[PDB]
Design a protein around this ligand. Structure first.
Ligand SMILES: C=CC[N@H+](Cc1ccccc1C(=O)NCc1ccc(OC)cc1)Cc1ccc2c(c1C(=O)O)OC[C@H](CCC(=O)O)O2
Ligand SMILES: C=CC[N@H+](Cc1ccccc1C(=O)NCc1ccc(OC)cc1)Cc1ccc2c(c1C(=O)O)OC[C@H](CCC(=O)O)O2
Lengths: 149, 149
């Protein structure tokens, strides 16, 4: 549980926003990329796993699950690559809701930056700091620290 | 102390590696950029503060300290922007040693990627996971979790 992440890809402004969600906390990292290739996804996972203790990644689609570049990044970084089949149907709903929330926040900040990437990083900040009362940033640290001890 | 970070800029392959170090743990994030402009630094700090609870950043030089774009990012993200004067002389040494270690690791992985950015992210991963015994990744989470609690 402390090490499980889920990939999510959403679209805005003719660009792709790649998101990794820490399932237990709802904490996220995200980046804007031109298109969702194996190489882009692989690089994103490499960054993520250097920053947080990523044990398992549920990939966002079959192309990323299949990609030998993504498999190679998971091998490199010691990540168990898994499918993202929503065996619990609540999973699709959670992702859909998160994409809607993120796009809402991006709208709220969109005029504060020229470039979408900037707005997306503002959105990451707002999402992770939002008290729901603990924030997702607080929850991830607490969950991982409890696991370490 | 749990919220204190230090910026650090080093050079390789005619490119710039921008590093943020969490002082208390030695945990790092880093990125390759073409050159160290106010905008690049501002964007990097925005990313960092969305991911970790950044209270204070000691800037790496006077240009980044002065930069109105950097001040604007720090305002946005609620970061106290400070100078990086080594009032404790041991600070220069620590930074220099870290740059040497980072460049060492990059050399050890350099043939596993075409692009320097990939090698730098591998180096971030290796540095953060290295046990010296706890890792820097373990230390940062424990320090912050203790602070929340
Ligand atoms: C077919 C992949 C290309 N190489 C092959 C390669 C070229 C030269 C030497 C070794 C290799 C090799 O296979 N090593 C094992 C390996 C595999 C996956 C992996 O995933 C992290 C890291 C390492 C690795 C690579 C991947 C993603 C990138 C890269 C690069 C790169 O070569 O630097 O560069 C930046 C790019 C940014 C995102 C974007 O622009 O899409 O993401
Ligand atoms: C002179 C700055 C340019 N704008 C001015 C702007 C343009 C339009 C509307 C508002 C503004 C505005 O001042 N808002 C307040 C503000 C200030 C600093 C800040 O820093 C996080 C974020 C927000 C903000 C900006 C900065 C760094 C970037 C950006 C962009 C951008 O406009 O999207 O785009 C990506 C780039 C990537 C790194 C690189 O390529 O150097 O970093």
């Amino acid at each position: 549980s402390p090490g499980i992440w889920q990939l999510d890809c959403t679209h805005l402004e003719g660009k792709v926003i790649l998101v990794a969600v820490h399932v237990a906390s709802g904490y996220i990292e995200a980046e804007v990329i031109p298109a969702e290739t194996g190489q882009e996804t692989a690089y994103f996972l490499l960054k993520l796993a250097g920053r947080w203790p990523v044990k398992t990644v549920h990939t966002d689609n079959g192309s990323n699950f299949t990609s030998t570049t993504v498999k190679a990044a998971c091998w490199w970084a010691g990540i168990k690559q898994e499918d993202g089949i929503p065996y619990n149907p609540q999973s699709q709903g959670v992702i859909e809701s998160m994409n809607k929330e993120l796009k809402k926040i991006i709208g709220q900040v969109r005029d504060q930056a020229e470039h979408l990437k900037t707005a997306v990083q503002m959105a990451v900040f707002i999402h992770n700091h939002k008290r729901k009362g603990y924030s997702a940033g607080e929850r991830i640290v607490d969950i991982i620290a409890t696991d370490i001890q």
